[PDB]
């Protein structure tokens, strides 16, 4: 259940109406790693297993804990990649309502592939959750170039990788419970305010 590759083995003959694209954390296992597969869970209860597209960054994103310390929080090769797959989604399902996530490493990838979309991609985005956003600080709790309004960020109070280091604390390890239910709900959420 670690990995999902709904978009990359899927067909434009056979669209899911939303496509969820997620960065893991450095050194997680799969392309979903730990809190991944509960998003993804939840979405499938809200949307149907047919009506949500699961979706992994895999491919160069090789979430090496070294690349945090990178001036972006993660390689431009794995931006490259995630950004790829946006424009993937958006070309095989136009109508597709978008929503992303990452944890770690991969809140930072999701913030900079974000920031680095062309708008008529971005827009599509309705909502995107980062846990551990090594880059919250930096960031003043946003993702450059992307509304406020769609974004929710999960920096627990003792996560120092929200306070401008990238010290890995006990409530670093913590955001389980976010990933089964307020994270996944505020996507949900978005999804259905644009869809109707």
């Known amino acids: 259940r670690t990995t999902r590759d709904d978009l990359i083995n899927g067909n434009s003959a056979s669209c899911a109406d939303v496509i969820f694209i997620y960065a893991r954390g450095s050194t997680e296992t799969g392309n979903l790693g ?7 869970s939840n979405l499938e209860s809200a949307f149907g297993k047919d009506g949500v597209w699961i979706q992994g960054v895999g ?51 999701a913030a900079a592939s974000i920031e680095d979309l062309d708008s008529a991609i971005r827009d599509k985005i309705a909502g995107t959750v980062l ?40 409530p670093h390890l913590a955001y389980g419970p976010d990933a089964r239910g307020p994270a996944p709900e505020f ?3 978005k999804v259905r305010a644009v869809r109707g």
């Open 187 to 189: 996507l949900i959420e």
């Open 59 to 109: 491919g160069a994103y090789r979430a090496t804990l070294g690349d945090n310390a990178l001036p972006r929080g993660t390689s431009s090769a794995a931006i490259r990649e995630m950004l790829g797959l946006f424009q993937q989604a958006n070309t095989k399902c136009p109508d597709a309502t978008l929503i992303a996530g990452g944890y770690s490493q991969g809140a930072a990838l």
């Open 131 to 170: 846990f551990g956003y090594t880059k919250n600080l930096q960031n003043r709790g946003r993702i450059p170039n992307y509304p406020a309004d769609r974004t929710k960020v999960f920096c627990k109070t003792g996560d120092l990788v929200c306070t401008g280091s990238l010290i890995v604390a006990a």
């Open 34 to 40: 730990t809190l991944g597969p509960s998003i993804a």
